[PDB]
Every structure is written in structure tokens, then in C-alpha cells.
Paper text:
Stabilization of Torpedo californica acetylcholinesterase by the divalent cations Ca+2, Mg+2, and Mn+2 was investigated. All three substantially protect the enzyme from thermal inactivation. All three cations raise both the temperature of the transition and the activation energy, with the transition becoming more cooperative.
The crystal structures of the Ca+2 and Mg+2 complexes with Torpedo acetylcholinesterase were solved. A principal binding site was identified. In both cases, it consists of four aspartates (a 4D motif), within which the divalent ion is embedded, together with several water molecules. It makes direct contact with two of the aspartates, and indirect contact, via waters, with the other two. The ASSAM server retrieved 200 other proteins that display the 4D motif, in many of which it is occupied by a divalent cation. It is a very versatile motif, since, even though tightly conserved in terms of RMSD values, it can contain from one to as many as three divalent metal ions, together with a variable number of waters.
Author numbering:
A (entry chain A), B (entry chain A): 4 to 535
The structure:
């Protein structure tokens, strides 16, 4: 029967689950690597030893060890992103949704969760693959990978903690999908990877990494790209942070070997409790243990790779949300509140600017301030609030993605760019936060098709629209229906740089996404910081 | 009779001249200093030795030696600013218009012509004082002063070419008005000095200079202020330029004495023909021989004087025109033409930016470019043209004047600020040049009251309006009529920074004149240049 499947690594048994009046198969918690436990903590992943007997794939796996967000307890807006399973270093598992009856050889989509490389789970309600597998006839996979120090502690030159092992976890899952997804009705030649925030950066990083390029066909990046200022560190800075982690836990620092031994003997929670102390600056939108520019996973610097065309050349679909910064301001900048309009005083604006651009010298902070201050109205608290939102959004997400899309399009085989600006009717966050980082994911996964979630009819329509864009792009490399009366989503080209609004209104075409501010962030400010 | 007047220096005979259906007395060409000729070239002025007999004051005097503008020969737009008398080093004379019958003790206004401190004449048609003396019952004086190297060659430390002698020429005329204007029906206690461009900067410089403050009551500055980037140089830079002038003329440079002797033996025209070669940069809105920050005429730096309140505290009225830059672009920047719309290419925009901010390093040029480029539309030739106009206008006139007005208002006794934006119906320059530097002067002097000049009725109305503002301010320190139904021109205050439009439409009140761009020019760019 469908629910019993054999794989090169063992037999797997899944469950028939309901979805929207019908049913499909789910294979939850399939292992793709050895448990990275004990002396394998921080090591590259090794492949899952094949198993005798049937592997029960009926329930979601454990989540990886991570910092848990408790700033707003008992509030669904935050807790929807927390782990909803027990946390464990034994966490390298993947989930597969397969339509019923099983397809012969159909399109595969692999989801890479975000969470700043320090958090995330494949098991979140919002990542439930069944609505997408069902409505669009695709084999939907969600993988997992180690986060925080467990996935990204980087002592470049050591073999026991080399960095990027979290990215290697993702590759090994991609490898396992590669060798085994046929058995589930999946076409290994038509794998689309997609992911949001750190998951979107991860996708770009597999586009760049030679060791990953053969494992998928095309890619979707949502509010994330590999060159984001928070998504990687130098080898030197990763070493600095790893040593500082040990220093925080009273470790022998005389040598990599002693440092790593100490860190391997600490309980997971003792590492998590000091994770944030290794950051060089007071900041927002900065995370301690992230990918490292090592010379192996990334042969050279990201910019040099992007300039020379040293990356997988294929089709990409990608975009951003309208209010990317507001989440991080609420959590980390003075004057913001979940319980008020968060009018920001001039004094708090200045504090926010420094937290948002922590690497900038004072001349750089003045440049940011002048670029974003309305000097006809410098005490308007709402303009200051919105200005910080744009600063955080532009610097951390939108302008790096625009730099990636312009560099990629010179060599790629087709680009589609969106600007998601629909605020869900049922959003639990306050209105000033707008179209929040992460809140397009629920439309991509079909959650508005469920009536118990009380979205509006227009919102269900937009979800079906988005899902059909995403799925058609995965199958054909083009999100547009082949010969439709519906408005086409135009290719983004070097010359005209078109993109679409994704919202409930009829699709509109625009050009040069926030081009003025991204010249500031991508050309001028870096030039000013290199000189001063 | 009126036309015969005695003065502490000699007797003076004037002419009865017609003006608008009536008549007034004119006293043209009264000398206030010894001819600064021969060995007195470059020396401070000495007062005019009193004379026996009647001085014929019937005709305009000679004009000072100056560079003559011949870039558009036989074109009234340019030739209206050229000397209209014979040029001579014997040029320190003043003119007086006195109403008929002679007033007992009425308000005096003294005009200081502009021309970049390298040109100008009291005798230009457009400076004809009769329409203002007549229509507003004031004793109108126009003075003169040495320009170019003759007025501003600066070898700080020498007594034979110390710098600022052109400004000393102006003071001595102010002194002569001070001791002698009673005899013409003038109240020496109620002298308003006023002036445009370099004349406006000159006014501010007498406001600042201790040796000048007692010689007038209040002041009007038109499109000029003492801190303009072109209106002064350091002692070191003035010395550099003086030596380079000698170098251009093959002089002994071993010593100030030898250098000055050589320069004193050259014909005026040999100095004029190399005047522009001493500029350190290819540039526009930069002039070779200007006031020097010497420690005597100016006790300390202008900024330190402005910060500490070390200046004459009284009432000031001042303002700018809408399109200050276009004159200098037409003459000196690539792509501009008197015979076309002057759409400016990206390549020519970049050249223009460097000519306009010649002291800026490359990072500074990028900052200017980014501040003034519309990156949604960077190839729009009209936007580039208008952007250069704003760059030249903001950097050279408007933002320095806004810095002066904000600094002055902290200590002064009342400020009135205008924004002149009427384009005369009969302007001979092309339309893209807009409201040109210098073209409010004809309204201040009443030229639209003459019907042979074919201004419109509204333009005559605006001229009478402006003349009554200027004259009432000179008499009372306030341009508003004491108890009128007419809209008041509000005081400019530190807190609300109000100003008015001066045009044919009903007066409008605005606040914070070009505040966004002047933060760039007055705070950020100087900070960037000091760091890099
Ligand atoms: C993506 O690559 C394909 C294949 O190289 C491109 O298609 C070819 O385009 C050339 C030039 O237009 C034609 O001469 C060939 O006949 C095409 N081949 C096929 C199989 O279609 C395609 O244009 C590329 N698309 C983008 C957006 O770069
Ligand atoms: C200009 O100076 C005058 C004189 O110092 C100011 O007038 C005085 O203002 C104070 C405070 O308002 C009053 O107590 C006096 O009675 C005023 N004296 C006279 C003679 O009027 C005047 O306010 C100043 N104006 C500005 C704009 O600074
Ligand atoms: C497969 O698993 C089903 C549900 O399993 C549950 O999770 C595991 C980890 C245990 O905690 C167990 O007690 C739970 O019920 C079972 O209902 C099902 O019978 C299992 N299938 C087989 C063949 O054992
Ligand atoms: C005063 O001057 C009047 C006009 O003078 C003219 O200018 C001078 C410089 C000479 O060039 C002269 O030839 C011109 O006529 C005379 O018309 C008038 O008579 C003069 N008055 C006296 C008392 O001499
Ligand atoms: C709306 O959805 C919530 C769960 O998100 C559910 O509890 C509620 O009952 C729904 N609305 C109504 C009217 O029932
Ligand atoms: C307009 O003024 C000019 C001089 O500026 C004059 O020559 C002309 O005759 C005037 N207009 C008419 C219609 O005469
Ligand atoms: C000191 C701990 O700081 C935690 C900062 O959290 C950053 C992420 O905030 C947004 C979470 O969805
Ligand atoms: C090399 C000579 O350059 C002359 C520049 O003239 C600058 C002033 O132009 C505007 C004249 O009204
Ligand atoms: Ca926003
Ligand atoms: Ca203009
Ligand atoms: Zn041990
Ligand atoms: Zn000699």
C-alpha cells in the first residue's frame, strides 16, 4: 500500500491524514543522518546507517536544541514560532507529504525553515505541508538542521568544529531526497528548494556552494538572501565568537582541541544560556553562530562568487514583505510596544539607528539618520517609528536581496520578483507592525484554505494564487499559466527590473524595488565605512 | 538751492533729474577717498583730501578695473552687468539721490553692488536710485569699492597689500556718509546698508566687523551672506593666490616687497588677464581675490564670531531667489546652453557636480550625487539639469544664508526672511534658468514702474510692494505697515523659522527654507570632509 515504502536506507511506514475533504499520505520523522550527539556535537553530519525493520514515520520528530522565545508568554503571535515538540540534539529528521493516490514521478518541493540560524523547526503548524502537497499535486518535503552553536560553531582549521555543519545537515537531507524521493512518487530531477529568512539565505547558499548545486533544479528565496549582513561571518569572527563562548563557560582556551572538549561536555542549555553574549555589539537582527566564509563550502567571498558567475545558473523566484523590520524593533529597540502605536521619540530613534547598524562608525550613523529623517518634521513620532522599520528592513533584508537579484540575473536563466504587502485580517500583532517578517509563509502553505482559521474569502483566493505560482514555478521554471487570460508575472530583467505586488487586489507591475535606498545601503554606506 | 550742498570735504553741485512725472536731485560721482593709484595700489584707502571750489556732481563716475564678461557679446542679458563707464583705478566715488524738496532728516539707504568681489559698478541702469528715492522719500546712496586683485590681493603681514582693502573702501564710504549725509537731508542715525550677492556678503561682513558696526543702523542681505564658501579665504590661501598671480606675471617672489613692487608696475589689464589662473581648482562660483580672514577686519573665524554673538545686534531683512545656480551653470558647466532646454546627460551631471563642489574628495562627490539623484529616473535630462541648479544654489547661496540667519537670530533684534520666486515677463534669458541670481534687484529699485520697460501691471504692483517693504524696514526696523489690513510678514524666529514668498500672488507664509538640503550642506557634508 501507499503508506509502506522502501528506501535505500530502510523501510518506512506513514499515516493517512485528512486534508480539506480528502486525504493524503504523510511520512513524518524520517532520519537522514546519524544523531549528532556526544562526541559528534559540532561535527559534520554522517549519513543515517540503514535500519532493519519498518521505521515508524507516523509522528513529528524532536526539534533541535535552540533558544526559545519567552518575551511574550502565552501569546500565539510569538509561540507559533517556538518548538512544538521536545528539543533534542537527536533532531536530524525530515518529513514528506505525498498525494493519494501516489503520483508516478511528480514535482518535489523542499522547505528550509528560517529563524536566524539560531532557531526553527520543521514541525510548526504553519509549515504543515499537507495543504500544498494536496492542492497542487507535489511531493512536499520539509527538512531540519542544527542551529545555534550546535550547527554553526566555527573553529576554522579544526576537523571537529569546522563551521557550516548546519548547512551540511541541509545538504545531507537534500542528498537523501536525491537518492530516495523516487520511492515516494517524487522526481529527483525536479526538486525546488525554498525557504524564508535564514531559510531563504540557506537556499542562496546552496545555489552558491559547488557541493550542493547538483542536488536541486531551481530555488525560491523568501525575505532572505545569502549576502545578508547577518547571514555569515568571517573565519576570524567565527573563531572569536567560538572562543568567547568557551570563555563564557570557563573553558580551557589553550587550543581548539581543549576548547571543543569543554564545549562538548556542557549540557545543551548551558550553551544556549550564554549564546547571545558572544555578539560584538549591542544590536538587533544579529545572531551569534551563523555560516562562516570558509573557502570550502564557499570557495571564495560571496561577492566575488556573485560577480564572476560562480554559482548554479537556473531559475529563481524570490521577494520580500513590506514591513520587514518591525518584528526586530518590537523585541529589541527602545520605545516599541506590542500594546501601543509605538510613536518613537528623537532620542529613541537615535538609539534604534545605532542598534540597527551596529558596525557603523559615527559618521555612518549620521549618514543613515540623514537619509531617513524628515527634517521638515523631525519630532513626528510616527515618522520615526516607520523610519526605523525601513532602516531595519532595507539594511537587513530588502537591499541585500536586491543586490543578490541584480547580480544573479546577469548569469541566471530567469528571475521572478515579488513584493508581498497583504496584512492578514486575523493578525494578532498590532497594526503598526504592518506586513510582518514571516507572515507570507502562511499563504504559501495554504493555511487560509482552512475555514477554522477564519481568513476571508479574498485571502483564500490569494493563497491559492500564491500556491499555484510557487508550484507551477517549481514544475516549469515559470510561475505563469501557459496560455491564460490572467495577467502575467513578468521576468525580472537587468534592464527593466520588474516585480509584482502579491496581495488581494489585481496584480500590479512595478520597477526598481526601493532603488533609492538600496543605492545608499549597497554602494554609498559601504564606501563611507571603508574610507573612515 | 537744493542742487548746491556743502560737505566737510568740499562743495558739491548736483543735477535735477526727472523721474516718473516729477523730479529729484542727483549728486553723481562724489569722491570719498584718494585715488588708489600708483604706489597706493593694493593699499588701504585714505580719505579724500578736501577740495576748493565746487565739485561737479552731475555725471556718473568711472568704474573700477575689472574683468569684463564677453561670453555673450551684444546680448543685453549679460551686458546689463558690464561696466557702462570708462574703467579706471581712479574709481572710489559714491552717488546720492535726494528727494525734492530736500527732506529735513529722513532715512538713508546705501547700496553695495555684487559681482563676486571681482566685478561690479554703482552706475548700472538697474542700480539707478532715483525711483526708490522718489517713491519712498529716502536718501538713496550707492557706493563703490575696488574689486579683483586691486581690492583683495592679500599678503597678510604686509602693510602695502594687507587684504580686504575693497571692504575698507566700503567702510570709508560708509564713514563719509556718516559724517556728511546730514547736509543732503539724510539722518546719519538711520542708515540701512543693502546689497546683493557679494554685496550681500559685504553687508554681513560689516555686521561682523567691529570697525564697521557703528556706521549703520540695520541691514538687508539679498542672495548673499558673509559665510558663503566663495566669499572669503584663509590668510594662507590668499597668500598662495597672490604669489601665484606674481608667478603668472614673471615677478620676483623672494619677498612680499619685491612681489608687490612687480605687481604695482603692471598695467591693470595684465593683472586682469591672468586673474582666473590662481584658483586652486577647476570650478564654478569661485573667485580669485576675495575677503581674507585676517584677525583684524575679522577678529576671529566667522563661525566663532557667529556662535559667540560677536557681531552688531540689530534688525536684518534678507532672502534668496528660487534658481540661484542657473547663471553659473550656463557660463561654466558642460551641457548648458542659452539656446536650448539644456537637458543634462548623466556624464555631464557628474562633471557639473565636481565643478560645483571642487573642494570635495570623491566620497564627498558621491554623497552630493546621491543626495540629488532620482534613482528611479537617473537618465532624465531635465531632472539632472534642475539637480545641478539646486546643488549650485543650495551650496553657494541658500544654505550658507540659512546658516547665517539661524545663527544671527539667536542674538539679533529681529529677522525677516523672503523667498523671491517671480520670473519677470520680459526676461531675456531662456526659461529653464528660472528666477535668476540677481533678477530681484530690478524690482527692489523700481524698474517696473517705468512703462518703457514693458513690465506687466502685476509686476509694477510687486515692485511697489517690495520697495515699500525695503523702505519701511529701513525706517522702522520692520517692513510691515503699522496698522494695516494687509497680511503681515512674520518675524523669522528660532522656533518656527517663518518666511514669505515674494511674487505677484497673495503673500504666503512657509517654514524651514530648504531645511533638508541645508542639513546636508551645513552639517553632514562638512563632517564627512573633515573625517576623510
Ligand atoms: C534559458 O536557457 C534556454 C536554453 O539555453 C534559453 O533558450 C534558448 O534561447 C536561445 C536564444 O533565445 C534560442 O536560440 C534557443 O532556441 C533556446 N532553446 C530552447 C531549448 O528554448 C532561454 O532563452 C533562457 N531563458 C532565460 C530567461 O535566460
Ligand atoms: C528688540 O529690543 C527691544 C529693546 O530691548 C525689545 O523690547 C523690549 O522688550 C522687553 C521684553 O519683551 C520689554 O519688557 C520692554 O518693554 C521692551 N522695550 C521697548 C522699548 O520696546 C524688543 O522686544 C526686541 N525685539 C526682538 C524681536 O528681539
Ligand atoms: C507507530 O506510532 C504510532 C504512534 O506513536 C506514538 O509515539 C511513540 C514515540 C510512542 O510514544 C508511542 O507510545 C505513541 O503511541 C502508534 O500508534 C503505532 O502503533 C506505531 N506503529 C507500530 C507498528 O508500532
Ligand atoms: C558739470 O558737468 C556738466 C557735464 O559734464 C561733462 O563731463 C565732463 C567730465 C566733461 O567731459 C564735459 O565736457 C562734459 O560736458 C557740464 O555740462 C556743466 O557745465 C559742468 N558744470 C560746471 C560748473 O562746469
Ligand atoms: C476563529 O479561529 C479560532 C482559532 O484560531 C477559533 O477558536 C474560533 O472559534 C474561530 N472563530 C469562531 C467564530 O469560532
Ligand atoms: C519694450 O521695451 C523696449 C526696451 O527694453 C523698447 O525698445 C520697446 O519699444 C518696448 N515695447 C514696445 C512695444 O515699444
Ligand atoms: C537577548 C535575546 O535577544 C533575542 C532577540 O530575538 C531576535 C529575534 O526576534 C524576533 C523573533 O521572532
Ligand atoms: C574663466 C572666466 O570665467 C568667468 C566665470 O564667470 C563667473 C560668473 O558668471 C556669471 C556672470 O554673471
Ligand atoms: Ca513600514
Ligand atoms: Ca531650479
Ligand atoms: Zn571529557
Ligand atoms: Zn619700479
Amino acid at each position: 500500500s501507499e503508506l509502506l515504502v522502501n528506501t535505500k536506507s530502510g523501510k518506512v511506514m506513514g499515516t493517512r491524514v485528512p486534508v480539506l475533504s480528502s486525504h493524503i499520505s504523510a511520512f513524518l520523522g524520517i532520519p537522514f543522518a546519524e544523531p549528532p550527539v556526544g562526541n559528534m556535537r559540532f561535527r559534520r553530519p554522517e549519513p543515517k546507517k540503514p535500519w532493519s525493520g519498518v521505521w515508524n514515520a507516523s509522528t513529528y520528530p524532536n526539534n533541535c536544541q535552540q533558544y526559545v522565545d519567552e518575551q511574550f508568554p502565552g501569546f500565539s503571535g510569538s509561540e507559533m514560532w517556538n518548538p512544538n515538540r521536545e528539543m533534542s540534539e537527536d533532531c536530524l529528521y525530515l518529513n514528506i507529504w505525498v498525494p493519494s493516490p501516489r503520483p508516478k514521478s511528480t514535482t518535489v518541493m523542499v522547505w528550509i525553515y528560517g529563524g536566524g540560524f539560531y532557531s526553527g523547526s520543521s514541525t510548526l503548524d504553519v509549515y504543515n505541508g499537507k495543504y500544498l502537497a494536496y492542492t497542487e499535486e507535489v511531493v512536499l518535503v520539509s527538512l531540519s538542521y542544527r542551529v545555534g552553536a550546535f550547527g554553526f560553531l566555527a573553529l576554522h582549521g579544526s576537523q571537529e568544529a569546522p563551521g557550516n555543519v548546519g548547512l551540511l545537515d541541509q545538504r545531507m537531507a537534500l542528498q537523501w531526497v536525491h537518492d530516495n524521493i523516487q520511492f515516494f512518487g517524487g522526481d529527483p530531477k525536479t526538486v525546488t528548494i525554498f525557504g524564508e529568512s535564514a531559510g531563504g539565505a540557506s537556499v542562496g547558499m546552496h545555489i552558491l556552494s559547488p557541493g550542493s548545486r547538483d542536488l536541486f533544479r531551481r530555488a525560491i528565496l523568501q525575505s532572505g538572501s545569502p549576502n545578508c549582513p547577518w547571514a555569515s561571518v568571517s573565519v576570524a569572527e567565527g573563531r572569536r565568537r567560538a572562543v568567547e563562548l568557551g570563555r563564557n563557560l570557563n573553558c580551557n582556551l589553550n587550543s581548539d582541541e581543549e576548547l571543543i572538549h569543554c564545549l562538548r561536555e556542557k549540557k545543551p542549555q548551558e550553551l544556549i544560556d550564554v549564546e547571545w553574549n558572544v555578539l560584538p555589539f549591542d544590536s538587533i537582527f544579529r545572531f551569534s553562530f551563523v555560516p562562516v566564509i570558509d573557502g570550502e563550502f564557499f570557495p571564495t567571498s560571496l561577492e566575488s562568487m556573485l560577480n564572476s558567475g560562480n554559482f548554479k545558473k537556473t531559475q529563481i523566484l524570490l521577494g520580500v514583505n513590506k514591513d520587514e523590520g518591525s518584528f526586530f524593533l518590537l523585541y529589541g529597540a527602545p520605545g516599541f510596544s506590542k500594546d501601543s502605536e509605538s510613536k518613537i521619540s528623537r532620542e529613541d530613534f537615535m538609539s534604534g539607528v545605532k542598534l540597527s547598524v551596529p558596525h557603523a562608525n559615527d559618521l555612518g550613523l549620521d549618514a543613515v539618520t540623514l537619509q531617513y529623517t524628515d527634517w521638515m518634521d523631525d519630532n513626528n513620532g510616527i515618522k520615526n517609528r516607520d523610519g526605523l522599520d525601513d532602516i531595519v528592513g532595507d539594511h537587513n533584508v530588502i537591499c541585500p536581496l536586491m543586490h543578490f537579484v541584480n547580480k544573479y540575473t546577469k548569469f541566471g536563466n530567469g528571475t521572478y520578483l515579488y513584493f508581498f504587502n497583504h496584512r492578514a485580517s486575523n493578525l494578532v500583532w498590532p497594526e503598526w507592525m504592518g506586513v510582518i517578517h514571516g507572515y507570507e509563509i502562511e499563504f504559501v502553505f495554504g493555511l487560509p484554505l482552512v475555514k477554522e482559521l477564519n481568513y476571508t474569502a479574498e485571502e483564500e483566493a490569494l493563497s491559492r494564487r500564491i500556491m499555484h505560482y510557487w508550484a507551477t514555478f517549481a514544475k516549469t521554471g515559470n510561475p505563469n499559466e501557459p496560455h491564460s487570460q490572467e495577467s502575467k508575472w513578468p521576468l525580472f530583467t537587468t534592464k527593466e527590473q520588474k516585480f509584482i505586488d502579491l496581495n488581494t487586489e489585481p496584480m500590479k507591475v512595478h520597477q526598481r524595488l526601493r532603488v533609492q535606498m538600496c543605492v545608499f545601503w549597497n554602494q554609498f554606506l559601504p564606501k563611507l565605512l571603508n574610507a573612515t
